[PDB]
């Protein structure tokens, strides 16, 4: 009975791939002028790695979708390499004795909310895309593990509350049979993927991410705008026939030539 917004029509079968992430905890402890020099190395050297990582994804966005998305990712790297935001973050660590994670979050707190004050679809979405840049940097400063979604081996369904352009830019379209998230759907980047790839998809799942586990067996109908959770074999066999009966009914159109 989960009715979404239906992004593309079609039927697919696959296990539920839930993406779980550990929340990041920021330490608000004040350091002494003795550890300050160390935070600069983790931030300066940290950007050295994040710059190399984001730089690689940039080409993945242009080689996967085309030079049209490379311009959006090209601007993001410019922000991180902004010599202005760098002098500020450093000033907060030495002027406010803040940690690299804490000082970095402060600047990112206003860079995102500021873009939200603009009434533009690009500058607004830039607000959400900018928050993703600081979130990554935070995981590199603490050395948190990164989830490699491009390392899948079994074709399954992708389920997530939402995916950010970067993650979508590196996602593997050959191992994913469809996308099902809890996004509004209007300006959802995922939806735009479904239209260009025409693959079946849904976004108005509401809270399916709070009622499904990984490996759950789900059937995407994308026809009557409905998803089945833990269906009985009797139902499966019933859908495997009709569903495939559609593909055969389509090939039957090729028979309207013999008529």
Swiss-Prot record:
Q: Which GO terms describe its cellular component?
A: cytosol
Stretch forming the signal peptide: none
The UniProt-reported impact of residue 122 to F is: Is not detected in polar clusters. Is completely diffused throughout the cytoplasm. Does not affect function in sugar uptake or interaction with TmaR
- Entry's localization field: Cytoplasm
Q: Which domain of life is it from?
A: Bacteria
Which BP terms in the Gene Ontology apply to this protein?
N-acetylglucosamine transport; phosphoenolpyruvate-dependent sugar phosphotransferase system
What PTMs does it carry? Answer: Phosphorylated on Tyr-122. Phosphorylation on Tyr-122 is important for polar localization but not for interaction with TmaR and for activity.
Further remark: The reaction takes place in three steps, mediated by a phosphocarrier histidine residue located on the surface of the central domain. The two first partial reactions are catalyzed at an active site located on the N-terminal domain, and the third partial reaction is catalyzed at an active site located on the C-terminal domain. For catalytic turnover, the central domain swivels from the concave surface of the N-terminal domain to that of the C-terminal domain. Enzyme I of the sugar PTS has been shown to phosphorylate NPr of the nitrogen-metabolic PTS, though much less efficiently than it does HPr. This process may link carbon and nitrogen assimilation.
What does the entry note on its domains?
Answer: The N-terminal domain contains the HPr binding site, the central domain the pyrophosphate/phosphate carrier histidine, and the C-terminal domain the pyruvate binding site.
Q: What is this protein called?
A: Phosphoenolpyruvate-protein phosphotransferase
Species annotation: Escherichia coli (strain K12)
Instruction: Please state the gene responsible for encoding this protein.
Output: ptsI
Question: What fragment of the full-length protein is this?
Answer: 1 to 258 of 575
């Amino acid at each position: 009975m989960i009715s979404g917004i239906l992004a593309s029509p079609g039927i697919a079968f696959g296990k539920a791939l839930l993406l779980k992430e550990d929340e990041i905890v920021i330490d608000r402890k004040k350091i002494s002028a003795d550890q300050v020099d160390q935070e600069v190395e983790r931030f300066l050297s940290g950007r050295a790695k994040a710059s190399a990582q984001l730089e690689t994804i940039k080409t993945k966005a242009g080689e996967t979708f085309g030079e049209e998305k490379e311009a959006i990712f090209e601007g993001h790297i410019m922000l991180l390499e902004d010599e202005e935001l760098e002098q500020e973050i450093i000033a907060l660590i030495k002027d406010k004795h803040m940690t690299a994670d804490a000082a970095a979050h402060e600047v990112i707190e206003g860079q995102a909310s500021a873009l939200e004050e603009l009434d533009d679809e690009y500058l607004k979405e830039r607000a959400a895309d900018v928050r993703d840049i600081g979130k990554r940097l935070l995981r590199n400063i603490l050395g948190l593990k990164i989830i490699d979604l491009s390392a899948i081996q079994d074709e399954v369904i992708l389920v997530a509350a939402d995916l950010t352009p970067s993650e979508t830019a590196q996602l593997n379209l050959k191992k994913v049979l469809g996308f099902i998230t809890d996004a509004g759907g209007r300006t959802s980047h995922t939806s735009i993927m479904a239209r260009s790839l025409e693959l079946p998809a849904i976004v108005g799942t509401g809270s399916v991410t709070s009622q499904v586990k990984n490996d759950d067996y789900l059937i995407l109908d994308a026809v009557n705008n409905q998803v089945y959770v833990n269906p009985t074999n009797e139902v499966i066999d019933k859908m495997r026939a009709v569903q495939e009966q559609v593909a055969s009914e389509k090939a039957e159109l090729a028979k309207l030539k013999d008529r």
